[PDB]
Ligand binder design. Sequence first.
Ligand SMILES: Cc1ncc(COP(=O)(O)O)c(CN[C@@H](C)C(=O)O)c1O
Ligand SMILES: Cc1ncc(COP(=O)(O)O)c(CN[C@@H](C)C(=O)O)c1O
Lengths: 410, 410
Amino acid sequence: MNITDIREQFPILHQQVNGHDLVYLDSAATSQKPRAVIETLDKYYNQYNSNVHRGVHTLGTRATDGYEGAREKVRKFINAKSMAEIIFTKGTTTSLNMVALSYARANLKPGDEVVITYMEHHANIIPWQQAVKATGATLKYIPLQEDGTISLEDVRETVTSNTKIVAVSHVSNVLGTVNPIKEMAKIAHDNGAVIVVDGAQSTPHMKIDVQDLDCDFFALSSHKMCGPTGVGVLYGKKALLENMEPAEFGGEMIDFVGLYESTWKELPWKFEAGTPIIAGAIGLGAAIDFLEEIGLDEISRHEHKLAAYALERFRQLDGVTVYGPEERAGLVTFNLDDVHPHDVATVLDAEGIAVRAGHHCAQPLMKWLDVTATARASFYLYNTEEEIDKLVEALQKTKEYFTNVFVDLE
Amino acid sequence: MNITDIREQFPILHQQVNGHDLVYLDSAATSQKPRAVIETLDKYYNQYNSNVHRGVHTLGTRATDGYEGAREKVRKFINAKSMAEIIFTKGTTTSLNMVALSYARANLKPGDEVVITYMEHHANIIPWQQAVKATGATLKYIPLQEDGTISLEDVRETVTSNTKIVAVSHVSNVLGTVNPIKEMAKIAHDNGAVIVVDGAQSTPHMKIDVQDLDCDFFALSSHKMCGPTGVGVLYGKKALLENMEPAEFGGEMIDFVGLYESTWKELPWKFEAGTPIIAGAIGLGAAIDFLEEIGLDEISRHEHKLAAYALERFRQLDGVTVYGPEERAGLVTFNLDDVHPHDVATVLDAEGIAVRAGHHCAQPLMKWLDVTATARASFYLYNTEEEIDKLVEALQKTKEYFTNVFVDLE
Ligand SMILES: Cc1ncc(COP(=O)(O)O)c(CN[C@@H](C)C(=O)O)c1O
Ligand SMILES: Cc1ncc(COP(=O)(O)O)c(CN[C@@H](C)C(=O)O)c1O
């Protein structure tokens, strides 16, 4: 896996920021796109852009072929059984909301439990809050161990026979934890519940097998896996998606429309109201082709390489706290002793290094960590060990600078 | 307004389809993009792609600036008062659904009336069906006159003091009708109702002034107005959007998140859950700049030119029925005597002409017209009179062909 060859595919990497070479370490917020994706979009808008499922003309046929072929590529990419289980959405947040919607609106009664975790992204928290509010059900949290992992026994004790939904992250955008999705799915099925995997931060970096995970729902975002913004995927088990009512209504999802009553389409289009994200989905299919040609397991090996390297180099800096397990997906959330994370991020950007600072849409986890904010650096398949070297050098320089400014206090 | 210069901006137009020069007459399903939009997307993914409202680094700042500047361009483009009234959505269908959602979930009681029309696109029908179902309210239809327009007196008689929502198209995707949105908004306000304008088919072709229309909600789709797929806009009066609850929940729309309770953000982000359609919105802003530089009133003049020309040339063909008024937005929905519309569309595509055939997501209107399906040709700012000449020549040739095949029946 030659990473110079891969980096040469991403034009955005080859620029300077504030006089320094760009060091992008914020892929967990959004990823960059290779020439293959951008040129897929260009070819779409230059040659065969048309609405799909409507006009029965040549450009319409090409666009329909592209969109549904993207659907098939997504099906292959996560080993779903049928394209009917692959629903194009706006992103992971929308997919989780769609499950929260048809569950709440039809399968939640008082006494039923929805169990989540303290590490969940807000997208995997608030929909369940609102659903249990609307239905009178109960919201429960799975506690975390002190290394930021989840114990299977805490799961088994928290999920009871009254649980209808277990909702859990595949990979934590803050701690780097990889959760035991398979065992948790088995435990949820033992208790008669479905399992909803937020796979937003796993899909870009590791192989997904929904058959092996036996997840009932899986949500992913294209903009993290080298794909266009504005598109993502909901996977649901076909049997479940048949019995869920649509979250949106309009064209492309109806069969018969009367003045007062309508019938829906078969899957997947039942859950795709309106003109779909045609270009975005075709570009996501291109992104999938790109990753599969690089190899997902090679990407996993590269990310474990970078994460072990980053962890080892962070322990070489005094006065830095890293949060989460040693076994991780390759992201480092941390803080500097007596330096605010926002300030860290600002000084890193003055060195051309891009990190995130704040709560990372995980306020309960921040409170659990007993911090108000944090800094995070996130790695992907275009990131190098030299970049982590640059990061840790800039962290040392930052701490030296704020010590040589603390001292200058008269 | 030089239209050769404009056509030279659209690379997709300069190709052949099935041996013939492409004649795209299906802009009402989706429009084509000028170099300015595609190159805006390219510049985004090549130079400053990053998530916006999160990382506080330079590329993040550029992307945030682009996204919110697109919001301001949309605000100017439709003369909204505040960016807080401009919400980025997936498209017109989603915006209408969002109004249907927060109205149903909080402002509809039994006895309340939601009034629509027989000409409404399915996107502006089914959400109201489902909302009155969930709330026990009543759904009413405004009848149409025999030329496919709406009489103001039928509106006044159909909307009563128990009406909370009047939902109506600005321009009909089938009949070409331009509805009296302003007078209808006044009548709805007189009865204490809000008015929801489906402006999906008006925004690309004519100037929008939400202040002059006094609409309470306005929905539009980017892919019709030379902009990217997968993005659209909901406009709501700020006072109304403050009191509506969000349709989606997750990051970017919260302020404080507790274990069980959360508070929302201020407008507009209250209604934008998750990573937004960054590239799509920036490209939509580019599309708006493009149209404003061409001039919306020049586009209206051009479309009235093409529609009058098309109507006059259609009356020159015997055995063709055109549906709708003489005063129109420039689209022609029609049928050939003893030729099925799908067949018409197929033969036109063999001549390289792109039209739509079917019900155009307006089944109640099709039944009202007493037809099961129809053919439609739709014009935009890159379409010429020569193309309508080609269309009517191919229609004459089609009818000659099916007469010289009816005769060959032994
Ligand atoms: C008046 C109107 N409203 C709403 C829509 C659909 O909204 P979306 O942008 O989300 O698709 C359309 C699209 N028509 C298309 C479907 C057509 O002409 O066949 C429309 O013409
Ligand atoms: C685990 C997880 N779930 C869900 C989301 C948001 O889904 P969208 O693709 O619709 O944004 C994110 C994005 N995180 C971003 C916000 C971050 O790292 O700050 C995420 O990391």
